[PDB]
Design a protein around this ligand. Structure first.
Ligand SMILES: [Cu+2]
Ligand SMILES: [Cu+2]
Ligand SMILES: [Cu+2]
Ligand SMILES: [O]
Ligand SMILES: [O]
Length: 476
């Protein structure tokens, strides 16, 4: 039994009406020989890669064929609130919604996923996610690996867990509200440990951590390096060689890796220091995909310089915003308890050395920002348009992982959890790590967001987002 080949999302561009059609629906998938109900865009699971060009507009027709409400958000894409597809961007079951995307940012790998109010974790777990490939005139000139599905390949990495009958086992409950939804099964573009045949020379991997709650850390099985060429919001100024690459939920990195004849190697993910995430089989390096070299030459390049990264401006005078994240200590303790009871000491491996009391104690609004669980009816503030602000995000008070994502922007990290960002994280980012400490980012919003269609700012640990760790804000 050979490994299955890596599934490759179709690369989708506009029709003569300048339209892209996306259908959201339920179908079936097979995992380890057992059928499961799954959801996808234009298919049963996951989704296509929407190709966009800077300075060109496209219209997307979104047909919701689910029997429940959903929304469609373009994570990493800088668009006005009205088409951002946050929780206010409801698409009724059996209905259609169209959005016009006016792309105005550099080449990047972004993605799209649902943002249904309090149910985002389930709708992603069930299968919904797709990709966005933005191109511009600058990137084409670099002559990067660019044959889609051959030497330029998307790698969407996600865990799931399943019940004995084969269905996806998703429950938003006290334990998962506390530590997140995670599983024992790793998927790569929906497949379990596929192989990808790649030509000899450079292979470009567009990595996405599409897990609800699990952080990842990519490496190769034989320790060849990864050359990071881009982050959430696009190219770095020059490649950054790494031996390992931590990737938070919702983050993307693009890397080049060498392919040499006769020497297959795996892309792997290394055990992380996050509660619950080092339970078997994740207590050891876990393969993601096998790269199978093909004795045909790859023509892409790894250029010395990629792009121009502007200077950080002066900070004095800029609006400082305070975002204090918090969790309910009682509900945090209870969830952590159930975790430890279920899996034992292994649920903290790698870490550093029952009655109804009513609505007030409901875990569904246990997580908050600035003492408020997400309130769709009330944006927490009005941010400035076209002006840099400094947003200060604190996780002091608990030790959970909060990958913080701000909609409507690509920002620069000034401090990541109390340290200046690593070089490959110093460019354009839409996510910043917050874990027991404080982060600060420099952000600018180029588009309007009104009260009725606010931008979200939230943890991308989906179960925390769904139970309150999110705020709305307006721009302009
Ligand atoms: Cu987003
Ligand atoms: Cu997102
Ligand atoms: Cu979001
Ligand atoms: O997002
Ligand atoms: O998100």
């Amino acid at each position: 039994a050979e490994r299955p080949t890596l599934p490759i999302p179709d690369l989708l561009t506009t029709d003569a009406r300048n339209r892209i059609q996306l259908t959201i629906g339920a179908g079936q998938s097979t995992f380890g020989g057992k059928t499961a109900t799954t959801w996808g865009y234009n298919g049963n699971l996951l989704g296509p890669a929407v190709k966009l060009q800077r300075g060109k507009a496209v219209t997307v027709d979104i047909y919701n064929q689910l029997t429940e409400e959903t929304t469609l958000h373009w994570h990493g894409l800088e668009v006005p609130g009205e088409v951002d597809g946050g929780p206010q961007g409801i698409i009724p079951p059996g209905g259609k919604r169209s959005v016009t995307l006016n792309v105005d940012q550099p080449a990047a790998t972004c993605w799209f996923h649902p943002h249904q109010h309090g149910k985002t974790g389930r709708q992603v777990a069930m299968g919904l996610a797709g990709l966005v490939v933005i191109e511009d005139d600058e990137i084409l000139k670099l002559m990067l690996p660019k044959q889609w599905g051959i030497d330029d390949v998307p790698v969407i990495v996600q865990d799931k867990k399943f019940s004995a009958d084969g269905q996806i086992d998703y429950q938003l409950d006290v334990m998962t509200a506390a530590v997140g939804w995670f599983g024992d099964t790793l998927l790569t573009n929906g497949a379990i440990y596929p192989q990808h045949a790649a030509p000899r020379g450079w292979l470009r991997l567009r990595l996405l951590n599409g897990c609800n709650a699990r952080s990842l850390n990519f490496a190769t099985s034989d320790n060849r390096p990864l050359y990071v060429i881009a982050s959430d919001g696009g190219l770095l100024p020059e490649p950054v060689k790494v031996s390992e690459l931590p990737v938070l939920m919702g983050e993307r990195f693009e890397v080049l890796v060498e392919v040499n004849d006769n020497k297959p190697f795996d892309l792997v993910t290394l055990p992380v220091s996050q509660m619950g995430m080092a339970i078997a089989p994740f207590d050891k390096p876990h393969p993601v995909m096998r790269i199978q070299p093909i004795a045909i030459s790859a023509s892409g390049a790894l250029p010395d310089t990629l792009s121009s990264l502007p200077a950080l401006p002066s900070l004095e005078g800029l609006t400082v915003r305070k975002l204090q994240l918090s969790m309910d200590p009682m509900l945090d303790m209870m969830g952590m308890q159930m975790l430890m009871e279920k899996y034992g000491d292994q649920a903290m491996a790698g870490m550093d050395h029952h009655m109804n009391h009513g609505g007030k104690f409901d875990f569904h609004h246990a997580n908050k920002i600035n003492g408020q669980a997400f309130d769709m009816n009330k944006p927490m503030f009005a941010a400035a348009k076209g002006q840099y602000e400094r947003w200060v995000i604190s996780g002091v008070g608990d030790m959970m992982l909060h990958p913080f994502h701000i909609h409507g922007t690509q920002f620069r990290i000034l401090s990541e959890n109390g340290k200046p960002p690593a070089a490959h994280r110093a460019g354009w980012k839409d996510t910043v790590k917050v874990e027991g400490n404080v982060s600060e980012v420099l952000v600018k919003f180029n588009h309007d967001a009104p009260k009725e269609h606010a931008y979200m700012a939230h943890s991308h640990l989906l179960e925390h987002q769904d139970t309150g760790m999110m705020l709305g804000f307006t721009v302009g």
